[PDB]
Amino acid sequence: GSEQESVKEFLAKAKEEFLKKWESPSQNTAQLDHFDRIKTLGTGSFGRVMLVKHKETGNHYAMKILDKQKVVKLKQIEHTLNEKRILQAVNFPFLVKLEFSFKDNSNLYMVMEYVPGGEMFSHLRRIGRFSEPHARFYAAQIVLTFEYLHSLDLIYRDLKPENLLIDQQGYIQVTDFGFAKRVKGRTWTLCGTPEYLAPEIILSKGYNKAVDWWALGVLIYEMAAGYPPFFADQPIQIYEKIVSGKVRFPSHFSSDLKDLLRNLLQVDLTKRFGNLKNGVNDIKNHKWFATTDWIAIYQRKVEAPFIPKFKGDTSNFDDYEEEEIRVSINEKCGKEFTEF
Amino acid sequence: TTYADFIASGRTGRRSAI
Ligand SMILES: O=S(=O)(c1cccc2cnccc12)N1CCCN(Cc2ccccc2B(O)O)CC1
Ligand SMILES: [Cl-]
Numbered sequence: 001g002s003e004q005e006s007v008k009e010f011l012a013k014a015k016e017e018f019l020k021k022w023e024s025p026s027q028n029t030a031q032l033d034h035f036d037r038i039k040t041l042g043t044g045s046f047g048r049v050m051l052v053k054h055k056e057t058g059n060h061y062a063m064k065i066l067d068k069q070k071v072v073k074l075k076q077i078e079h080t081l082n083e084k085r086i087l088q089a090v091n092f093p094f095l096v097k098l099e100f101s102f103k104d105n106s107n108l109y110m111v112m113e114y115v116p117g118g119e120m121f122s123h124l125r126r127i128g129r130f131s132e133p134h135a136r137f138y139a140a141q142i143v144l145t146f147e148y149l150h151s152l153d154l155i156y157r158d159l160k161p162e163n164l165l166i167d168q169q170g171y172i173q174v175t176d177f178g179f180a181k182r183v184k185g186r187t188w189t190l191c192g193t194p195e196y197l198a199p200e201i202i203l204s205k206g207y208n209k210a211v212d213w214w215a216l217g218v219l220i221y222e223m224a225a226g227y228p229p230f231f232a233d234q235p236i237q238i239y240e241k242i243v244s245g246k247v248r249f250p251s252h253f254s255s256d257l258k259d260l261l262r263n264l265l266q267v268d269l270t271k272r273f274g275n276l277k278n279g280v281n282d283i284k285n286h287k288w289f290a291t292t293d294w295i296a297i298y299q300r301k302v303e304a305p306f307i308p309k310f311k312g313d314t315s316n317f318d319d320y321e322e323e324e325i326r327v328s329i330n331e332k333c334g335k336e337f338t339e340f
Numbered sequence: 341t342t343y344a345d346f347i348a349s350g351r352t353g354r355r356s357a358i
Contacts (some may be wrong), residue, residue: 081357121354162354181358193355227346250342 003295014091018152021089029339030100030111031325034040034240035063038312040320047069047107050325051114051314060312061099062115065325066108068333070167070220077336079178083195084110084340085179086154093300094145096165096173105328115173117308119221121161129226132257134305138164139174139220140297146216146257147280152208155183158287159215160196161222170304185209194235195228213274215282217264225250229265243267256288 001087005080014035035052042049054061070081075163087098087110100111117123120138124130130138142159149156167172179191186206198214200207229248230241245267249258262285267271273282283292296302308316346352 125352158357160355191358193357195351195355197358227343231346231349231351233349233351248342 003156005160011148014148017091018089021071021198023086025339026088026101028102030102030109031105032102032109032325035061035111035199036327039314039317040322041314041317043320046074046076048320048323051312052111053312060114063114064110064112066110068103068106068108068161068337071108073335076178080108081337081339082180083176083178084194085106086189087112088182090152090177092145092151092296094141094172094174095315096175098328101340103337105331106326108337109237109339114166115165116311116313117166117168118171118318119162120164120166121308123166123308124161124223124226130223132224132254132288133291133304135223136292137185137297137302138172138223138304139216140289140292140294142216142219144175144294144298145172145174146209146274149180150212150280153182153184154180155187155209156180156212156215157192158218160193161219162193166306166308168308168310169300171300171328172306193239195222195230197239197242198269199326200269202239202243207269208275210269210272213264213272214266214273217261220257220264221247221249222260224253229261254288256286260286260288263267 034055036055037245038051038053040048041051041062048071050063052061052063053059071077081201082321084098084101084292089097095111098112100109102109110280132248135322143299146156158176163174165175167173181187186208190201192201196215196218198207198211201211218228232236232238232241247265248260249261260273263273273286273298274280276282283289293302
């Protein structure tokens with residue numbers, strides 16, 4: 001009741017701050033000609049991410065540029081408005097920080113601190129797999145991040161190595177929040193990425209924050225094995241495996257790791273760790289985490305097992321054709337994005 | 341091996357949301 005009461009008090013203040021920012025979001029805190037473009041870091045079906053330099057300060061940022069017309073075409077208005085509203089309201093060491101946002105006739109812009117270490121995904125595929133201490137270090141950060149997000153009644157719903165950055169201290173930054181939803185009870189949308197979907201998302205019953213603990217199990221498995229627990233040529237075949245209740249482990253997994261994963265990759269949501277009476281403490285007190293100093297992880301005082309090569313450098317991102325950023329003379333989709 | 345089956349699945353690159 002010292003450590004536990006400190007966390008309760010911390011989370012109560014955190015919720016008060018979150019709700020104030022959620023109710024009165026920041027808007028229009030920069031403009032495009034404050035920035036020079038350097039390089040395209042990523043492309044998607046309705047936007048791009050660009051490395052940019054702030055002209056006055058010289059600071060580097062990742063600028064997410066979303067084409068309003070394409071957002072409307074692909075039915076992503078609510079997700080995009082939600083992502084920005086969440087990002088400007090949350091505050092936690094392992095969440096990316098929104099520095100500026102604004103819009104113009106054509107685009108929405110979210111400007112975030114640049115993290116040159118890139119995605120966990122690339123590092124994992126390059127090295128093959130992480131040792132269990134390395135995986136555990138990242139897993140502990142996700143456990144704490146979900147403890148925070150769930151205390152705000154947010155379900156995260158898109159955990160995967162693609163959405164985790166590794167910063168220059170070797171710690172994680174969670175990137176994407178469009179799918180994050182306020183859920184005190186249950187929700188029903190089929191959304192996420194096939195390999196990481198909990199059975200109850202596939203099966204069309206309502207679901208709750210316990211899906212994030214299932215996804216943690218998938219992430220830990222993929223980090224430690226180099227491949228996810230459920231894979232196949234086509235998503236429908238992946239879904240059949242997920243709901244089956246059967247999983248196999250590499251022979252190099254420790255006994256403690258297998259026991260944790262059997263309890264996270266638990267199809268019966270009423271038996272799944274994270275979702276029992278003692279909540280996240282069943283995970284934090286599990287034998288696999290016995291060596292984890294949870295407070296030291298939160299304070300970023302643990303020496304990271306891996307620090308990306310320090311080189312403005314973009315070597316941890318792929319190369320893309322550089323295309324114009326065109327801003328129309330006509331305002332597009334103004335009413336739809338009024339709150340951005 | 342299971343790894344070989346993972347490679348054969350074709351889903352070794354970045355994965356999109358559904
Ligand atoms: O480009 S990111 O790695 C990235 C995201 C956020 C902050 C960043 C700070 N420094 C470096 C990179 C950064 N990235 C991580 C997840 C992958 N998407 C894919 C994407 C690409 C284009 C448009 C949208 C999206 B989306 O997500 O919804 C792009 C964002
Ligand atoms: Cl890829």
